[PDB]
Amino acid sequence: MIVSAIAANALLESVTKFHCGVIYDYSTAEYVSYRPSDFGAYLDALEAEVARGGLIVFHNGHKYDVPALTKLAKLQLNREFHLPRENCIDTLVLSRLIHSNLKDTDMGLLRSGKLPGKRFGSHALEAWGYRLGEMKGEYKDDFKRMLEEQGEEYVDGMEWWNFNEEMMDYNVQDVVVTKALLEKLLSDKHYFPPEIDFTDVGYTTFWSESLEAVDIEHRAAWLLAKQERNGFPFDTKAIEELYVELAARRSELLRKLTETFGSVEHVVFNPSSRDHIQKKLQEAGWVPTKYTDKGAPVVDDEVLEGVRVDDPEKQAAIDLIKEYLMIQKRIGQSAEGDKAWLRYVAEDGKIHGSVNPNGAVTGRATHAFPNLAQIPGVRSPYGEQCRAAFGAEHHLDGITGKPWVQAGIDASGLELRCLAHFMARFDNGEYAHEILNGDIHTKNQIAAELPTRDNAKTFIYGFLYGAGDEKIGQIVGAGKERGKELKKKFLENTPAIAALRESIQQTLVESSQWVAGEQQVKWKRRWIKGLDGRKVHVRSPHAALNTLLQSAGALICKLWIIKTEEMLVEKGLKHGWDGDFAYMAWVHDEIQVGCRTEEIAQVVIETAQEAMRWVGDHWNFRCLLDTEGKMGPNWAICH
Amino acid sequence: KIIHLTDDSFDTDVLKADGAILVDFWAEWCGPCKMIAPILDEIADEYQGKLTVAKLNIDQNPGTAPKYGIRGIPTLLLFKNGEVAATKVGALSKGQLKEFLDANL
Known part of the structure; x- marks a missing residue:
């Protein structure tokens, strides 16, 4: 097994030249430095680990490094370079797998002052360097501040335009944190058994002696990275032909939505920002029912449909506002957004x-x-x-x-069949066959005693995911009274569901206790x-x-x-x-x-x-x- | 003895008044406007002969104020035959309003 990390000129979209890369071999126990003329020998060293049947350790390699080394080998050396999925590992993926719960844990580490607040949630190499105590300095900040003070500003990533002996050293810096992060993940025995030292085994043994999730995740990350490079074909003209029809509808409505009203101060208000509908409905005689935690009245799609005012013009204008906000949403997603679709369409279409x-x-x-x-x-x-x-x-x-x-x-129907699987242990495949027999929503309706099958559909998912008794009662137009009895009746007609929460609670856990209206749900x-x-x-x-x-x-x-x-x-x-x-x-x-x-x-x-x-x-x-x-x-x- | 104005009745009662017209561009939710409101009541009684006091609430009449570029209230405008003679913004005292009016008449 070898550990490496590379340095390129830019991102996967416009990367053109390979700068440097370092390969630490666990057999040799010594690093090797490569330079922009040693790119050819760099590709050979990775192939040698493939020929032996070993492993290649990258951080974010499945998404960047490996396909970049595929792209760079075609235009610079005119050679086909492809690392097989079986003999390459991405610590970044394992980090997201093994330590999905870490921040969380980082609260004390954040309070400690050991872990930067800008790397609060990052699985990136830099975020991990401070965690291992191996961060001697970051190449991202030691360059930016040098652009301000030592002359000439900058815009977005210019510390990779060309090689420098400090990059060659910070390329090593990225490798030793990658090595240490790998060993930190291999020391978690829930995934990697102790009886096997994964730092010195073949690729065939690595996948098989590891937890099944470990194998899937590298297959998953490799597959999804291909989809990103595959991309989704896009009809640019069509969305453009919609922004015209919507902006015109927005502009024509904006003109009409100033016809009904009617407003150290000036006035220009249009349908956007909470100070809009709130300022007019409190002039058409609307008493807010549901409020928010800050105090402001609720102005969502739900309440707007039921807003009734004695003013016919104001009332009819409500539906015109309803359209406007929806128009902005589609516009704000396909055109007028920082992440709008039209902005991400590459040159391939x-x-x-x-x-x-x-x-x-x-x-x-x-x-x-x-x-x-x-x-x-x-x-x-x-x-x-x-x-x-x-x-x-x-x-x-x-x-x-x-x-x-x-x-x-x-x-x-993936959700309910998964439910049928965990409860087939107590009813001997009863609920599972009800899926196959069909109309499981009909049976859930009878089991929970609901008037319509649609009421059973909206019940089964909400009830399963922890819904209050008010929200369940609101299905049939009631409160927690009908809600409590609707859920209890469903439990009595479906014993297996309750018994499922026994096997889960007997796995085991702790015990809970209520103190004067506060949920103190603890657990072991x-x-x-x-x-x-x-x-x-x-x-x-x-x-x-x-x-x-x-x-x-x-x-x-x-x-x-x-x-x-x-x-x-x-x-x-x-x-x-x-x-x-x-x-x-x-x-x-x-x-x-x-x-x-x-x-x-x-x-x-x-x-x-x-x-x-x-x-x-x-x-x-x-x-x-x-x-x-x-x-x-x-x-x-x-x- | 103070005239309350609308947008329709602003063209004739003020611009065509042929006399001294002091219009207060006020509002219900302003702090300094509530302070000059008692002062204007007394001004209307004393100046009842060489000046006419008028008030325009910019909430019920939102069309007049823009045509005079209201950047702050209370806004006192001493109209002289359809023309703006002098303008002053902010809650003036009784002594300060008296000084203003006696200077422009």
Whole structure:
């Protein structure tokens, strides 16, 4: 096993030259420094560890270093350099896996003055250097301040434009923290058994003697990084053709929304910022019902629908304000935002939405710049146009010239089937078969005694995730009276659910106690074992069920999207826009895959189902898992 | 003895008044305006002959004040035949208002 870290000129988008890199070998126990002319020998040293069957240690390498060394080897040395997924490890991913609960713990470390406040939550190398006491100095701050005082300002990352002997030394600095962070993660025996020294083993042994989550996470981070580089094809013109129709609607409404009113001070107010609707409704005679913790009256979509005033003009204007705020939201996400979609469209015509894998307590990843996991759906206004802008048809084939086709496959009722799995231990697969028998929402309706099946649908998820008795009662238009009795009745007709909280409470935990209206829910065990065996720190026993199921559901999907692509590669298909298919977006339980021909998409749909059954078989799931696929051009059709 | 103005009745009662018109651009939520309000009541009685006191509430009549660029209130405007003779902003005292009026008349 070898440990390394590199230095380039810029980020993955416009990286052109390799500066330096250091490789510490655990067999030689000595560092090796490389320089911009030693780039060729650097690639050889990594291949040697691949030839021996060892491992290559990078921090943020699965997302940056390894694909950059793939990109840099093509334009500088004109050689193909690709590190296999099996013999490369990313400490950054392990950090997000092993120590998802650390800050948290860092509160005392933050109070200590040992850990910078700007690195409060970062799994980055610099954030870890102070934690290990190996930070002798940061190259990010020792350059910026030198730009102010020693002449000539700067804008965004210029400390990498060219090599310097201080960079060569801070490249070493990045390596020794990477080594020490690796050993800090290998010393956690919940994932890495003590009987095996993972610092001196082959790649075949490393994955197998480690916890299953360790293997998945490196497969997951590698896969999702490909999706980011795959990107989501984007019809720029279409969103532009909407900003015109919305800004005109905003401008025409803005003109009309100054026709009803009517305002050391001046006056110009328009529908935005809490001092707007609050200032006019308190002139149309509106008495606020629900307030907030700061004192200000609640002005959300809920209360606005019920705002009734004696003034017909003011009343009819409410619906005009309702439209305005919604117009700004779509505009503020697709055009008028700091993270607007139009700003992230690269030169290829695709949006490369980033994704932080299991760097999210339990399961589903986090998406940003832009958040691909909050594009308005087809059921919301103007969402049909929005979802249509994210489609494989917006990327023509680099060869045939044909518009690619999109395949949308989701996990059918993943949440309740995960629930059926943990409660099949007490009812002997009763609830699990009710899923297969169909209409589980009909049975939950009878079990909880609800008037409509839709009332059962909104009940089962809220109840499972720790909802009050008021909120449950508000489903049928009541309060905690009907709420308490609705939940207690559901528990009596579904014994297994209550018995599930026995096995969980008998795992074991502590005991709780109420003191005069304060929830003092303590606990002894604040970590649930997952399906892959990882620690899921969860929260208080007040809910926890939601975390257990969502951990189950999202970890299933992680293996699901991994096994599908492995089978697609196994079946012979090629991943990448120069191949046959490309992962575009992963949303909780659904994924969007670009496909060169409709025929390829059909195999994808079948393959996705085959992987979902293999996952269910692998972990011996007590309930049956299934998926449904939809073929089409864009996202509005595949969902 | 003070005239309360609207936006429609500002063109005739003030600009076409042909005389001395002191208009207070005031408001209900201003602190210094509540302070000059008792003063203007007494000014209307004493100056009843060579000057007319008038008040415009900028909340119920939001169209007049912009045309005179109100950057602060209370804003006293001594109108002289449709023209603005002198302007002063802020709560003047009874002695300070008297000095102002006797100087411009």
